[PDB]
Coordinates of C-alpha atoms in Angstrom, one line a residue:
Chain L
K1 CA -21.9 -2.0 -16.6
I2 CA -25.1 -2.3 -18.3
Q3 CA -27.8 -4.6 -16.1
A4 CA -31.3 -5.9 -17.7
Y5 CA -35.1 -6.2 -16.0
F6 CA -37.0 -8.8 -14.9
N7 CA -38.5 -12.3 -16.7
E8 CA -39.9 -11.0 -19.5
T9 CA -36.8 -10.8 -21.8
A10 CA -33.2 -9.6 -21.3
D11 CA -31.3 -8.0 -23.4
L12 CA -27.4 -8.1 -23.7
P13 CA -25.7 -5.3 -26.0
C14 CA -22.6 -5.8 -26.6
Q15 CA -21.6 -2.0 -27.4
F16 CA -19.1 -2.7 -30.6
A17 CA -18.4 1.2 -31.6
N18 CA -16.5 -0.6 -34.5
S19 CA -13.7 2.0 -35.3
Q20 CA -12.2 0.5 -38.1
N21 CA -15.6 -0.3 -39.3
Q22 CA -15.2 -3.4 -40.8
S23 CA -17.7 -6.0 -42.1
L24 CA -19.4 -8.9 -39.5
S25 CA -18.7 -11.2 -42.9
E26 CA -15.5 -12.0 -41.0
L27 CA -16.6 -11.2 -36.8
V28 CA -16.4 -13.6 -34.6
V29 CA -19.2 -12.6 -32.2
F30 CA -20.3 -14.3 -29.0
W31 CA -21.6 -14.2 -25.5
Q32 CA -20.5 -16.2 -22.5
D33 CA -22.1 -16.7 -18.7
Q34 CA -19.6 -16.3 -15.5
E35 CA -19.0 -20.4 -15.0
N36 CA -17.8 -19.3 -19.0
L37 CA -20.8 -21.6 -20.5
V38 CA -21.3 -20.5 -24.3
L39 CA -24.1 -18.8 -25.3
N40 CA -24.2 -18.0 -28.7
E41 CA -22.0 -18.3 -31.6
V42 CA -21.2 -16.1 -35.1
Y43 CA -18.9 -17.5 -37.1
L44 CA -19.0 -15.9 -40.3
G45 CA -22.5 -14.2 -39.9
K46 CA -24.4 -17.8 -39.3
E47 CA -24.7 -19.3 -36.1
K48 CA -22.9 -22.5 -34.6
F49 CA -25.0 -24.1 -31.8
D50 CA -22.2 -27.5 -31.4
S51 CA -20.0 -25.1 -28.6
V52 CA -23.2 -23.7 -26.6
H53 CA -23.8 -26.2 -23.7
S54 CA -27.2 -28.0 -23.2
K55 CA -28.9 -25.7 -20.8
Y56 CA -28.9 -23.0 -22.9
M57 CA -29.7 -25.2 -26.2
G58 CA -32.3 -23.6 -28.5
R59 CA -34.0 -21.0 -26.0
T60 CA -31.6 -17.4 -27.3
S61 CA -31.6 -15.5 -30.7
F62 CA -29.0 -12.7 -32.5
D63 CA -30.4 -9.6 -33.8
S64 CA -27.6 -8.3 -36.0
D65 CA -28.5 -5.0 -36.8
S66 CA -28.7 -4.2 -33.4
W67 CA -26.1 -6.3 -32.0
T68 CA -28.0 -7.6 -29.2
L69 CA -28.3 -10.8 -27.9
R70 CA -32.2 -11.5 -26.6
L71 CA -32.4 -13.5 -23.5
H72 CA -36.3 -15.3 -23.5
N73 CA -37.8 -17.2 -20.8
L74 CA -35.6 -16.0 -18.1
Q75 CA -35.0 -18.2 -14.8
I76 CA -33.9 -17.1 -11.4
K77 CA -30.4 -19.5 -11.6
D78 CA -29.7 -16.7 -13.9
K79 CA -28.2 -13.9 -12.2
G80 CA -24.8 -13.9 -12.7
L81 CA -22.8 -11.6 -15.0
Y82 CA -22.9 -12.1 -19.0
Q83 CA -19.7 -11.3 -20.9
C84 CA -19.9 -10.8 -24.7
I85 CA -16.8 -11.7 -27.2
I86 CA -16.1 -10.0 -30.1
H87 CA -13.4 -12.2 -32.5
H88 CA -11.9 -11.0 -35.4
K89 CA -11.4 -14.1 -37.3
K90 CA -8.2 -13.5 -39.6
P91 CA -5.8 -16.6 -41.5
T92 CA -3.0 -15.6 -39.4
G93 CA -4.6 -16.0 -36.4
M94 CA -7.7 -15.2 -34.3
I95 CA -7.2 -11.8 -32.8
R96 CA -10.2 -10.9 -30.1
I97 CA -11.0 -7.4 -30.6
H98 CA -13.8 -6.3 -28.0
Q99 CA -14.7 -7.8 -24.7
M100 CA -17.4 -6.5 -22.0
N101 CA -18.8 -7.0 -19.3
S102 CA -22.3 -7.0 -18.2
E103 CA -24.5 -7.7 -15.6
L104 CA -28.4 -10.0 -15.2
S105 CA -30.7 -9.4 -12.2
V106 CA -34.2 -10.8 -12.0
Chain H
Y1 CA 6.7 16.5 -6.3
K2 CA 7.7 13.4 -8.6
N3 CA 6.7 9.8 -7.6
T4 CA 9.9 7.3 -8.4
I5 CA 10.7 3.8 -8.8
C6 CA 12.6 2.0 -5.2
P7 CA 15.7 1.0 -5.3
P8 CA 16.8 -2.3 -5.9
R9 CA 17.1 -5.1 -3.3
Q10 CA 18.1 -8.2 -3.6
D11 CA 14.6 -9.5 -1.9
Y12 CA 11.2 -7.5 -3.0
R13 CA 8.8 -8.1 0.2
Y14 CA 5.9 -5.6 -1.7
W15 CA 4.4 -7.7 -4.9
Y16 CA 2.1 -6.2 -7.4
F17 CA -0.1 -8.6 -9.1
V18 CA 0.0 -7.0 -12.9
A19 CA -0.6 -9.8 -15.2
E20 CA -2.3 -13.4 -16.1
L21 CA -0.9 -15.4 -18.8
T22 CA -2.0 -18.6 -19.9
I23 CA -0.4 -19.5 -22.9
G24 CA -1.3 -22.7 -24.4
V25 CA 0.7 -25.5 -26.0
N26 CA 0.1 -28.6 -28.1
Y27 CA 2.8 -30.7 -26.3
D28 CA 2.2 -32.6 -23.2
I29 CA 2.9 -31.4 -19.7
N30 CA 2.0 -33.5 -16.9
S31 CA 2.1 -31.6 -13.8
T32 CA 4.3 -28.6 -12.2
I33 CA 7.5 -29.3 -11.5
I34 CA 8.9 -27.6 -8.6
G35 CA 12.4 -25.4 -9.5
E36 CA 11.5 -25.9 -13.1
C37 CA 11.2 -21.9 -13.4
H38 CA 13.8 -19.3 -14.1
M39 CA 13.6 -15.4 -14.4
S40 CA 15.7 -12.6 -15.5
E41 CA 14.5 -9.3 -14.7
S42 CA 15.7 -5.9 -16.4
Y43 CA 14.7 -2.2 -15.5
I44 CA 17.2 -0.2 -18.7
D45 CA 15.4 2.7 -19.6
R46 CA 12.0 3.2 -18.1
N47 CA 10.8 -0.2 -19.7
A48 CA 11.0 -3.4 -17.8
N49 CA 11.8 -6.8 -19.2
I50 CA 10.9 -10.3 -17.5
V51 CA 12.5 -13.2 -19.2
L52 CA 10.9 -16.6 -18.2
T53 CA 12.8 -19.5 -19.4
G54 CA 10.6 -23.2 -18.2
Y55 CA 8.4 -25.5 -19.5
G56 CA 9.4 -26.0 -22.6
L57 CA 8.9 -22.0 -23.5
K58 CA 11.3 -18.2 -23.5
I59 CA 8.6 -15.6 -22.8
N60 CA 10.5 -12.1 -23.2
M61 CA 7.8 -9.9 -22.5
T62 CA 8.6 -6.1 -21.6
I63 CA 6.7 -2.9 -20.7
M64 CA 7.2 0.7 -21.9
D65 CA 7.6 3.2 -20.6
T66 CA 7.0 2.2 -16.7
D67 CA 7.8 2.8 -13.5
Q68 CA 7.6 -0.8 -12.6
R69 CA 10.6 -3.3 -12.8
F70 CA 9.5 -6.9 -12.5
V71 CA 10.4 -8.7 -9.2
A72 CA 8.4 -12.0 -9.2
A73 CA 6.7 -14.7 -11.1
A74 CA 4.9 -18.0 -10.6
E75 CA 4.2 -21.0 -13.0
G76 CA 2.0 -23.8 -12.6
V77 CA 0.7 -26.5 -15.7
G78 CA -2.9 -26.8 -15.7
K79 CA -5.3 -29.7 -17.5
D80 CA -5.4 -30.2 -21.2
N81 CA -1.3 -28.6 -21.8
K82 CA -2.0 -25.1 -20.5
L83 CA 0.9 -23.0 -18.6
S84 CA -0.9 -20.1 -16.5
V85 CA 2.3 -17.3 -15.5
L86 CA 1.6 -15.4 -12.6
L87 CA 3.6 -12.4 -13.3
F88 CA 4.3 -9.2 -9.8
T89 CA 6.5 -6.0 -10.5
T90 CA 6.5 -3.7 -7.1
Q91 CA 3.7 -1.1 -7.1
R92 CA 1.4 0.8 -9.8
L93 CA 2.2 4.7 -9.2
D94 CA 0.6 5.8 -12.8
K95 CA -3.1 5.4 -13.6
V96 CA -2.4 4.3 -17.2
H97 CA -2.7 2.0 -19.2
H98 CA 0.9 0.0 -20.5
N99 CA 2.6 -0.7 -24.2
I100 CA 3.2 -4.5 -23.3
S101 CA 5.9 -6.9 -25.9
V102 CA 5.3 -10.6 -25.4
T103 CA 8.3 -12.6 -27.1
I104 CA 7.2 -16.9 -26.8
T105 CA 9.6 -19.0 -28.0
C106 CA 9.8 -23.0 -28.0
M107 CA 12.6 -24.2 -26.5
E108 CA 11.4 -27.7 -26.7
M109 CA 8.9 -29.5 -29.5
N110 CA 8.0 -27.4 -32.8
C111 CA 10.9 -24.8 -32.1
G112 CA 11.1 -22.6 -35.2
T113 CA 11.4 -19.3 -36.7
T114 CA 8.7 -16.7 -36.5
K115 CA 5.3 -17.5 -37.3
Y116 CA 3.3 -14.9 -35.7
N117 CA 4.0 -11.3 -35.3
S118 CA 1.5 -8.6 -34.3
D119 CA -0.7 -6.1 -33.0
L120 CA -2.7 -7.3 -30.2
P121 CA -5.8 -5.0 -29.1
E122 CA -7.4 -4.0 -25.5
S123 CA -10.0 -6.4 -25.7
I124 CA -11.5 -3.9 -22.7
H125 CA -11.3 0.7 -23.1
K126 CA -9.1 0.0 -26.3
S127 CA -5.9 2.4 -25.5
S128 CA -2.8 0.0 -26.1
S129 CA -1.7 -2.6 -28.1
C130 CA 0.8 -5.5 -27.2
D131 CA 3.2 -6.2 -29.5
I132 CA 3.4 -10.1 -29.7
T133 CA 5.2 -12.7 -31.4
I134 CA 5.9 -16.0 -31.8
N135 CA 9.5 -18.3 -32.4
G136 CA 7.9 -21.2 -32.9
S137 CA 4.1 -23.4 -33.7
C138 CA 4.2 -24.6 -30.2
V139 CA 1.7 -22.5 -28.7
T140 CA -2.0 -23.5 -28.8
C141 CA -3.0 -19.8 -27.8
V142 CA -2.2 -16.8 -25.8
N143 CA -3.9 -15.0 -23.0
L144 CA -2.8 -12.1 -21.1
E145 CA -4.7 -10.3 -18.6
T146 CA -2.4 -7.1 -17.8
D147 CA -3.8 -5.8 -14.4
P148 CA -6.6 -8.4 -13.2
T149 CA -9.2 -8.2 -9.9
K150 CA -8.6 -11.6 -8.9
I151 CA -5.7 -13.7 -7.4
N152 CA -5.8 -17.4 -8.7
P153 CA -6.8 -19.2 -5.6
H154 CA -4.8 -22.1 -6.0
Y155 CA -1.2 -19.2 -5.5
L156 CA -0.5 -19.5 -2.2
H157 CA 1.5 -16.5 -1.0
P158 CA 4.8 -16.7 0.6
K159 CA 4.4 -16.1 4.7
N160 CA 7.1 -12.8 5.2
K161 CA 5.7 -10.9 1.8
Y162 CA 2.3 -9.2 0.7
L163 CA -0.1 -9.3 -2.3
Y164 CA -1.6 -6.1 -3.8
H165 CA -4.6 -6.9 -7.1
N166 CA -5.6 -4.4 -8.8
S167 CA -9.5 -3.6 -7.6
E168 CA -10.7 -0.9 -10.3
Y169 CA -12.1 -2.5 -14.0
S170 CA -11.1 0.3 -15.5
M171 CA -6.9 -0.7 -15.4
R172 CA -8.2 -4.1 -16.9
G173 CA -6.4 -5.1 -19.7
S174 CA -7.2 -8.3 -21.5
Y175 CA -4.9 -9.9 -24.7
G176 CA -6.1 -12.7 -26.8
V177 CA -5.0 -14.8 -29.5
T178 CA -6.0 -18.1 -30.9
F179 CA -4.7 -20.2 -33.5
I180 CA -7.0 -22.8 -33.4
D181 CA -10.1 -23.4 -34.2
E182 CA -12.0 -23.5 -30.9
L183 CA -13.7 -20.1 -28.8
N184 CA -11.5 -19.0 -25.9
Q185 CA -9.7 -22.6 -24.8
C186 CA -6.9 -20.1 -22.9
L187 CA -8.7 -20.2 -19.9
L188 CA -8.2 -22.9 -17.7
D189 CA -9.9 -25.5 -15.9
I190 CA -8.5 -24.3 -12.6
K191 CA -9.7 -27.5 -10.1
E192 CA -6.5 -29.2 -9.6
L193 CA -3.4 -26.6 -10.8
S194 CA -0.3 -26.0 -8.7
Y195 CA 2.1 -22.6 -8.8
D196 CA 6.0 -23.0 -8.6
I197 CA 8.0 -19.4 -8.3
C198 CA 10.6 -19.1 -10.7
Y199 CA 13.8 -19.1 -9.0
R200 CA 16.5 -16.5 -9.9
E201 CA 15.8 -13.1 -8.3
Chain I
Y1 CA 36.5 21.4 34.8
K2 CA 34.7 20.5 31.7
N3 CA 32.6 17.1 31.1
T4 CA 33.3 15.4 27.9
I5 CA 31.6 13.0 26.2
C6 CA 33.0 9.2 27.0
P7 CA 35.2 7.3 24.2
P8 CA 33.9 5.4 21.4
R9 CA 34.1 1.7 23.0
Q10 CA 32.5 -2.1 21.0
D11 CA 29.9 -2.3 23.0
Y12 CA 28.0 -0.3 25.0
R13 CA 26.5 -0.9 28.9
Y14 CA 25.2 2.6 30.0
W15 CA 22.5 3.8 27.7
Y16 CA 19.9 7.6 27.9
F17 CA 16.2 6.9 26.6
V18 CA 16.6 10.5 24.2
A19 CA 14.3 10.2 21.9
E20 CA 10.5 8.0 21.0
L21 CA 9.9 8.4 17.2
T22 CA 7.0 7.2 16.3
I23 CA 6.6 7.4 12.2
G24 CA 3.2 6.3 10.5
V25 CA 3.1 4.1 7.1
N26 CA 0.4 4.3 4.8
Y27 CA 1.5 0.0 4.0
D28 CA 1.4 -2.2 5.7
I29 CA 3.7 -4.3 8.4
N30 CA 2.5 -6.9 9.9
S31 CA 4.9 -7.5 13.0
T32 CA 8.0 -7.0 14.1
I33 CA 10.9 -9.3 12.5
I34 CA 13.7 -9.7 14.2
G35 CA 17.0 -9.1 13.3
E36 CA 15.2 -6.7 10.0
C37 CA 17.3 -3.0 11.4
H38 CA 20.7 -1.9 10.9
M39 CA 21.6 1.2 12.7
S40 CA 25.0 2.9 12.0
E41 CA 26.2 5.7 14.4
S42 CA 28.4 8.1 13.5
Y43 CA 29.9 11.3 15.6
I44 CA 31.7 14.2 14.1
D45 CA 32.7 17.6 15.1
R46 CA 30.0 17.6 18.2
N47 CA 27.5 15.7 16.1
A48 CA 25.5 13.0 17.0
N49 CA 23.7 10.6 13.7
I50 CA 22.2 7.6 13.4
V51 CA 21.0 6.0 10.7
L52 CA 18.1 3.6 10.7
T53 CA 17.6 1.3 7.7
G54 CA 14.4 -1.6 8.6
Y55 CA 11.0 -2.1 7.8
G56 CA 10.3 -0.2 4.5
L57 CA 12.2 3.2 6.1
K58 CA 15.5 5.4 6.4
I59 CA 15.3 7.4 9.7
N60 CA 18.8 9.8 9.4
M61 CA 18.1 11.7 12.3
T62 CA 21.3 14.5 13.8
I63 CA 21.3 16.2 17.0
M64 CA 24.3 19.4 16.8
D65 CA 25.5 20.5 19.2
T66 CA 25.8 17.6 22.1
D67 CA 28.0 15.7 23.7
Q68 CA 25.8 12.7 22.9
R69 CA 26.2 9.5 20.6
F70 CA 23.3 7.8 19.1
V71 CA 24.1 4.0 21.0
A72 CA 21.3 1.8 20.5
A73 CA 18.4 1.6 18.7
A74 CA 14.9 -0.8 19.3
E75 CA 12.8 -0.5 16.3
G76 CA 8.7 -2.1 16.3
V77 CA 6.0 -2.2 14.6
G78 CA 2.5 -1.7 16.6
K79 CA -1.3 -1.6 15.2
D80 CA -2.6 0.4 12.7
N81 CA 1.0 0.5 10.7
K82 CA 2.8 2.3 13.3
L83 CA 6.6 2.5 13.3
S84 CA 7.7 3.2 16.9
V85 CA 11.7 3.6 17.1
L86 CA 13.7 4.4 20.4
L87 CA 17.0 5.4 20.5
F88 CA 18.9 5.2 23.3
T89 CA 22.5 7.5 23.7
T90 CA 25.0 7.4 26.5
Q91 CA 24.3 10.6 28.8
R92 CA 23.2 13.8 29.0
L93 CA 25.9 16.5 30.3
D94 CA 24.2 19.2 29.5
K95 CA 20.5 20.6 30.7
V96 CA 20.2 22.3 27.6
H97 CA 17.3 21.5 24.4
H98 CA 19.0 20.5 21.3
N99 CA 18.5 21.1 17.7
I100 CA 17.4 17.8 15.8
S101 CA 17.5 17.2 12.1
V102 CA 15.1 14.1 10.4
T103 CA 14.9 12.9 7.0
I104 CA 12.8 9.8 6.7
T105 CA 13.1 8.5 3.0
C106 CA 11.4 5.6 2.0
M107 CA 13.4 3.0 0.1
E108 CA 10.0 0.9 0.0
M109 CA 6.6 1.4 -1.9
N110 CA 5.9 5.1 -2.2
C111 CA 9.1 5.8 -3.1
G112 CA 10.0 9.6 -4.9
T113 CA 12.0 12.8 -4.0
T114 CA 11.3 14.9 -0.9
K115 CA 8.1 16.1 -0.2
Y116 CA 8.5 18.1 2.8
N117 CA 11.2 19.9 4.4
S118 CA 10.4 22.0 7.5
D119 CA 11.1 23.3 10.7
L120 CA 9.0 21.5 13.7
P121 CA 8.9 23.0 16.9
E122 CA 8.8 22.2 20.0
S123 CA 5.3 21.8 21.2
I124 CA 6.1 22.8 24.9
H125 CA 8.9 25.3 26.3
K126 CA 9.6 26.6 22.6
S127 CA 13.4 26.6 22.6
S128 CA 14.6 24.5 19.1
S129 CA 13.4 23.5 15.7
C130 CA 13.3 20.2 14.2
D131 CA 14.8 19.8 10.4
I132 CA 12.9 17.2 9.0
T133 CA 12.1 16.3 5.5
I134 CA 11.0 13.2 4.2
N135 CA 12.3 11.6 0.6
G136 CA 8.6 10.1 0.0
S137 CA 4.8 10.0 0.6
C138 CA 5.0 6.7 2.5
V139 CA 4.8 8.5 5.7
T140 CA 1.0 9.4 7.6
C141 CA 2.7 10.9 10.7
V142 CA 6.1 11.5 12.3
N143 CA 6.4 12.4 16.6
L144 CA 9.6 12.4 18.1
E145 CA 9.6 13.1 21.9
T146 CA 12.8 14.1 22.4
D147 CA 13.9 12.9 26.0
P148 CA 10.3 11.8 27.6
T149 CA 10.0 10.3 31.1
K150 CA 7.9 7.0 30.5
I151 CA 9.7 3.8 28.9
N152 CA 7.2 1.8 26.7
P153 CA 6.4 -0.7 29.5
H154 CA 6.5 -3.6 26.2
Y155 CA 10.7 -3.2 25.9
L156 CA 12.6 -5.8 27.8
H157 CA 15.4 -4.0 28.4
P158 CA 19.0 -6.4 28.3
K159 CA 20.5 -7.8 31.8
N160 CA 23.7 -7.1 31.4
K161 CA 22.7 -3.1 30.4
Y162 CA 22.1 0.0 32.5
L163 CA 19.1 2.2 30.9
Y164 CA 18.2 5.8 32.5
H165 CA 15.2 8.4 31.3
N166 CA 14.7 11.5 32.3
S167 CA 12.6 12.7 35.0
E168 CA 11.7 16.3 35.1
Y169 CA 9.3 17.7 32.2
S170 CA 11.6 20.7 31.4
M171 CA 13.9 18.8 29.6
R172 CA 11.2 17.1 27.4
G173 CA 10.6 18.4 23.7
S174 CA 7.7 17.1 21.3
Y175 CA 7.5 17.6 17.8
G176 CA 4.3 16.3 15.5
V177 CA 3.2 16.8 12.1
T178 CA 0.5 14.8 10.2
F179 CA 0.0 15.3 6.8
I180 CA -4.0 13.2 6.9
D181 CA -6.8 14.8 8.5
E182 CA -6.8 12.7 11.3
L183 CA -5.7 14.0 14.6
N184 CA -3.4 12.9 16.3
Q185 CA -3.4 9.3 15.2
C186 CA 0.5 9.6 16.2
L187 CA 0.3 7.8 19.0
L188 CA 0.1 3.7 19.0
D189 CA -1.9 1.2 20.5
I190 CA 0.5 -0.4 23.2
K191 CA -1.4 -3.3 23.4
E192 CA 0.5 -6.3 21.8
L193 CA 3.8 -4.7 20.6
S194 CA 7.0 -5.9 20.7
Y195 CA 10.2 -4.8 19.8
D196 CA 13.8 -5.5 18.4
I197 CA 17.5 -4.0 19.0
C198 CA 19.1 -3.1 15.4
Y199 CA 21.9 -5.0 14.7
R200 CA 25.6 -3.3 14.1
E201 CA 27.4 -1.0 16.8
Chain X
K1 CA 1.7 22.1 35.6
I2 CA -2.6 23.7 36.0
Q3 CA -4.8 21.8 38.5
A4 CA -8.2 22.8 39.0
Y5 CA -10.5 22.7 41.9
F6 CA -14.2 20.4 42.7
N7 CA -17.2 19.9 41.8
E8 CA -18.4 23.2 40.1
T9 CA -16.7 23.7 37.1
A10 CA -13.4 22.8 36.1
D11 CA -11.1 25.5 33.8
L12 CA -8.8 24.2 31.5
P13 CA -6.2 26.2 29.7
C14 CA -3.6 26.2 26.9
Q15 CA -1.6 29.4 27.6
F16 CA -0.6 29.7 24.3
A17 CA 1.9 32.7 24.5
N18 CA 1.2 32.9 20.4
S19 CA 5.1 34.5 19.2
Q20 CA 4.4 34.6 15.8
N21 CA 0.8 36.2 16.5
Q22 CA -0.8 34.1 13.6
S23 CA -5.0 34.2 13.8
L24 CA -7.6 31.3 15.7
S25 CA -9.1 30.9 11.7
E26 CA -6.1 28.9 10.7
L27 CA -5.2 26.9 13.9
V28 CA -6.3 23.3 15.0
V29 CA -7.2 23.3 18.8
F30 CA -8.2 20.3 20.6
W31 CA -8.0 18.9 24.0
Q32 CA -6.9 14.9 25.0
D33 CA -7.3 12.9 28.1
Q34 CA -4.6 10.7 29.9
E35 CA -6.5 8.0 28.0
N36 CA -5.7 9.3 24.9
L37 CA -9.7 10.5 24.2
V38 CA -10.3 13.5 22.3
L39 CA -12.3 16.4 24.5
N40 CA -13.4 18.7 22.2
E41 CA -12.2 20.0 18.7
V42 CA -11.6 23.2 17.1
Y43 CA -11.1 23.0 13.6
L44 CA -11.1 26.3 11.6
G45 CA -13.3 28.3 14.8
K46 CA -15.9 26.1 14.1
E47 CA -16.5 22.9 16.6
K48 CA -16.3 19.3 15.4
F49 CA -18.0 16.6 17.6
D50 CA -17.3 13.5 15.4
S51 CA -13.2 12.6 17.3
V52 CA -15.2 13.3 20.6
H53 CA -15.6 10.7 22.4
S54 CA -19.0 10.1 23.5
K55 CA -18.5 9.7 27.3
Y56 CA -17.1 13.6 27.4
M57 CA -20.0 14.0 24.5
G58 CA -22.2 17.5 25.1
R59 CA -20.4 18.6 28.1
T60 CA -17.7 20.6 27.6
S61 CA -17.5 24.4 26.4
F62 CA -15.2 25.9 24.6
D63 CA -14.3 29.9 25.1
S64 CA -12.1 31.2 22.1
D65 CA -10.8 35.3 23.5
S66 CA -9.1 33.1 27.4
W67 CA -8.5 29.6 25.0
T68 CA -10.2 27.7 28.1
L69 CA -11.7 25.0 27.9
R70 CA -15.2 25.1 30.4
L71 CA -15.5 21.2 32.2
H72 CA -18.9 21.4 33.7
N73 CA -20.3 18.6 36.4
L74 CA -17.2 16.8 37.1
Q75 CA -17.3 13.2 38.1
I76 CA -15.4 11.1 40.5
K77 CA -13.6 9.2 37.2
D78 CA -11.9 12.2 35.4
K79 CA -9.1 12.9 37.7
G80 CA -6.4 11.9 35.6
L81 CA -4.3 14.9 34.0
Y82 CA -5.9 16.4 31.1
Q83 CA -3.7 17.7 27.8
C84 CA -4.3 20.7 25.2
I85 CA -2.5 19.8 21.8
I86 CA -2.6 23.0 19.3
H87 CA -1.8 22.5 15.9
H88 CA -1.5 24.8 12.8
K89 CA -2.8 23.5 10.0
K90 CA -0.7 24.4 6.8
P91 CA -1.9 23.0 2.6
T92 CA 1.3 20.9 2.7
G93 CA 0.8 19.2 6.3
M94 CA -0.2 19.6 9.9
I95 CA 2.7 20.9 12.1
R96 CA 2.2 20.6 15.8
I97 CA 3.0 23.8 17.2
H98 CA 1.6 24.1 21.3
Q99 CA 1.4 21.1 23.3
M100 CA 0.4 21.7 27.2
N101 CA 0.0 19.1 30.2
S102 CA -2.8 20.6 33.0
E103 CA -3.9 18.6 36.2
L104 CA -7.7 17.7 37.8
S105 CA -8.1 17.1 40.8
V106 CA -11.8 17.0 42.3

């Protein structure tokens, strides 16, 4: 498990090894709270904000080269663990390939 | 010295929480019906097998190369037409991940031939593969959490029985597939959920 | 004149407290279940034998070269997962120590092949040996006090029966083995203990 | 049974015959009260005080040549019988080889 530091900027990495070495162009990359609210969404390289909850609306950033969510302006309430989920979109069916759970203490 | 599987008995008093199956369906099931689920167990040539008939579905789930046999199952219906399945074997005598093969067939509503047959990886530790195959178009999504660290609180264990579950993250495994354009939604609401223990074995 | 063993009858009204077995287990048994223990007795070729199925264990304990046959057994579960076994034969017609062989197999939890097979001496008088063998890894410790001078006070004898126990220290025998790094701990807490008489014979 | 004398120093002997003639280097030699509290502990020739009860803490001595516990500064409460237990430590399993029961009147 990976934790983050105090109220400046939290880093939430998925740490995908990418063993099959597929591209991000067909990959669904997203994060989620312990109370099971979606943080950010990536569908095919474009961020989608419809499933993002209003309490995390317009307050998170995504970096594709480092595969990391940057969580700005931390509050006292968000001390729970955050899990990032990586699905592989196929027209036959959407396959979850990677999940990881990290922590956040401020 | 080699640990072996205990000999089969009529009633099993020690249960190990092995799996957490939340297969979703696009048809309506309103509530958990008492005495609906019927379970048939098998252990032939070191492969556990369970067949679950209930709530319009047959679940033929088998585990390869194990010293565990399925001894119990509890089925419940959550909100948004979600079918939670809890599975219990004897005991964990090994600390390795096991290969899983689950066949989900529709016996009501959208019956049909095989729509899906694939290998679902471990979401965590990438150490095993689930051979999933779905005989029907009636399944929204599949979520199988092998060896969970937490029991669902709405499941009331019997008084004369004993329950053990995994406490280490290293033995957790997650398999998931969705066939509709929604993130997750295999997970339940767990606000009003009730469980029924399957009939046979 | 030679004293002989009495002929077998359906119900035995005179009981002799012969042994005090406190086999410990690393799995949980919460309380004594009424009607759980099942005992099968045998006396073939001057060797007493008792098979005790209950609380996840089978106890095949035999005594060599005796004029006693096992007529009763009472089983109870103490604290810290301790299984106390009280054994009763007909009568003591000899003042010599007898060789003891006990097989303890696990029918639940940690079943497996033989982990232990040894000769446990008398702790006192060094006059006999117990051939112990354990089919499983589910046993914490074994304590067998042959011919005890004191009955456990929590065991309530039946009203129409009669109980006799040893009163001399010279006929006491103690065998013990532990498999964990604790001194003793075969002995029970005897604060809240209840006993159940086994079913058959 | 062996008893001891009044309030000067009590001697508690195990009286091991040692018929197999094994050494004390692999032998667990210890004493215990009638209310089943450990008096002294010897593991492999070193005294261990973790299992020793606090009422007998720092008040007993051991002699290896005579295999005897010396019980100093006797009190009125300790008039019960004391039993000494001798286990034989083996990596397969710890075997109790000898026990004996003695008495104490002051």
